[model samples]
Target: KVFGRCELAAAMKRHGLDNYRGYSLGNWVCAAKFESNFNTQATNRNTDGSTDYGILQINSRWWCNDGRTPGSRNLCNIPCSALLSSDITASVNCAKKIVSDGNGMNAWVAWRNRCKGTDVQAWIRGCRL
Candidate 1:
């Protein structure tokens, strides 16, 4: 029971309902490792010379839209559905919350802790539950 529960939770926390429950944490860690190369500093430069930031590929341009009006909320920053769903974790959490059921608070917190600074593998190491 604990095993199945934890697995589903982990699946939802990372992949949402997209269905990658069969995948282990190592799989995503590897995927993120390959794409990000464990470089949280990774970014994508747009043709317009803008940028996207972070591990899961959070867009910095959308994080803070420039050249329009200071402190003005823009649709480009966060999506319509996301904005409508507004809250603290409205964006990062929508994906996280959906998947955190089975792992217990320990795995969930460990993932967030790893994300806070850097060192991808270390994050998994922290999941001592």
Candidate 2:
């Protein structure tokens, strides 16, 4: 909900995705595309009986608590609702924490599967980043 695809690249580039943990902005953009189509409020039910949240699709099982969720690790100690916002500051911060924890973009399956080997440079094409 924060942005469309091109707008997201510009926003993400402004958020420092260009150099954040050495991850390419394209991969982040691509991940956003496949994960949530840039919808911040997007939620997906996982096969493991967990949920992925926000633009980054962070997992509720380990990253944040959904309040009603029991046995959640909540490594970020954040409410899952915090990630589902039009303002993506908290989501970006949480994503940084995830990448900083030695997970990198590997923390997101969309990045690993859809974005990894693709020609990703085009993600920033019209955004003029």
Candidate 3:
């Protein structure tokens, strides 16, 4: 499923991402926009054999178990496939875990390059959350 910008913002807020771990809903929304373009099924395979999965692009190397990423830690203890569900609950939960694990929002390079240290509120402007 592909979410509209506002729709994804509301969803992330509902899932408790709003200011989770010092990152705002706008931060998550902006990260999602760049990481997956709000698509639930987005996936990227890295050269090291790890795969990034779902809206937040949770990686198989440390978060989800894809059964293929070399040296996978499966820290989130979930199958990587779970991150691709249109419901996005699993993806949101896993993302929270990632942030809580000390990586913060920097867990995603997309966020670093596109959303970090910027006016991310623009990403959520006019969206009633």
Candidate 4:
């Protein structure tokens, strides 16, 4: 919802990435491999994003920071006093109140997916960005 490898690549346009496909080639592979093996619906209880919409290895619990919500004084909307970390995009989005490409790229890169001990060259062998 909030983030998927495909969308994540498109998001780089805001970060001044000349080639969304190229730059995100690594992102796509890495994110897919580590998060959910390319599963866009990967949902974890913890993430840096502000909500549960995170997919492809992203979960709000591990991603959120601002702890802000849709409204005020509601149980679900209540601020979790979430910590701030660049590893998760939520801190950047909620704190700065921005998720578009330009503002969120730095925060996005802070937390990269894992490789499962796979070599980059090998993983990227047939991939062409």
Candidate 5:
């Protein structure tokens, strides 16, 4: 699915992402943009030998199982493909679990290297929510 910044922000707000687990919405939005540009179907291979899935770019090695990779923690217990949908439920649920695990958004390398300390207010700019 495709999302402009406003739409993405709206969707995340609807999912209670803002301040969820004490994480800022700006950070989440920044991670979504830098990781996948709000494309739910987005996927990429990380240099560390893990696959990233969905708009949040969750990692297969620790978060979800893709069946191809072995020894996944599968902490979320959801298929990696579950995140690749227009509905944000799976992504949101898994992401919350990730943060609760003590990694927070830092679980996402894209968030750490690119989103931290960045001015990401534009991600929610002009959203009705």
Candidate 6:
């Protein structure tokens, strides 16, 4: 499912993404905007043969098991398919893990390039927390 900007912001807040790892909710929202455009089932194949999956684009190269990414660590211990679910529980949980694992929000290049060091509040502006 594709979410409206505020809708995605609210969802991310409910999932405790607000201020997670010192990154604001808007940062997460912005990352999702660039990563998957708020679409739950988005996927991108990387040049290294790994695939990024779901709203936050959790990677099969290290996070989820896609059964295709070579040398996948599957650190999230979940099938890559789980990230595509509309419920978003697995995706959010794995995202938290990705942050807590010391990568912070920089785990996503989209965040670093687009969302990082920007006025992220715009991503969630007028969204009721």
What are the lDDT figures for the candidates, one per model? 0.38, 0.85, 0.91, 0.35, 0.85, 0.91
Q: What's the lDDT of the predicted structure labeled candidate 4? A: 0.35
TM-score of each: 0.32, 0.91, 0.96, 0.35, 0.92, 0.96
lDDT of 6 at 70: 75
Show where candidate 4 strays beyond 4 Å. 1-18, 21-24, 47-49, 52-100, 103-106, 109-121, 127-129
Report how far off residue 61 is in candidate 6 (Å).
0.7
Evaluate residue 29 in candidate 4 and report its C-alpha lDDT on the 0 to 100 scale.
43
Order of candidate numbers by TM-score, starting with the best: 6, 3, 5, 2, 4, 1
What does each candidate score in C-alpha RMSD? Answer: 12.4, 1.5, 0.9, 9.6, 1.3, 0.9
Give residue 84's lDDT in candidate 6 (0 to 100). 94
lDDT of 4 by residue, 1-129 (tens): 334444544343343342342333343345434544433344444332244332233323433332443232222231333222222333223422222425333334322324323353343444333
For residues 6-69, could you state the per-residue lDDT of candidate 6 as single tens digits?
A: 9888888888989988988989999999999999999999999999999999999899998898
- For candidate 3, lDDT tens digit of each residue in 1-129? 999999999999998999999998889999999999999999998988899999999999899898898777988789999999989899998898989987799888999988999999999999987
Deviation in Å, model 2, residue 85 alpha carbon: 0.7
Mark the regions of model 5 whose C-alpha exceeds 4 Å error after superposition: none
Model 6 residue 56 lDDT score:
94
Query: How does residue 72 of candidate 2 score in lDDT?
Result: 72
Error of 2 at 49 (Å): 2.6
**Steric collisions counted per model:** 6, 2, 0, 11, 0, 0
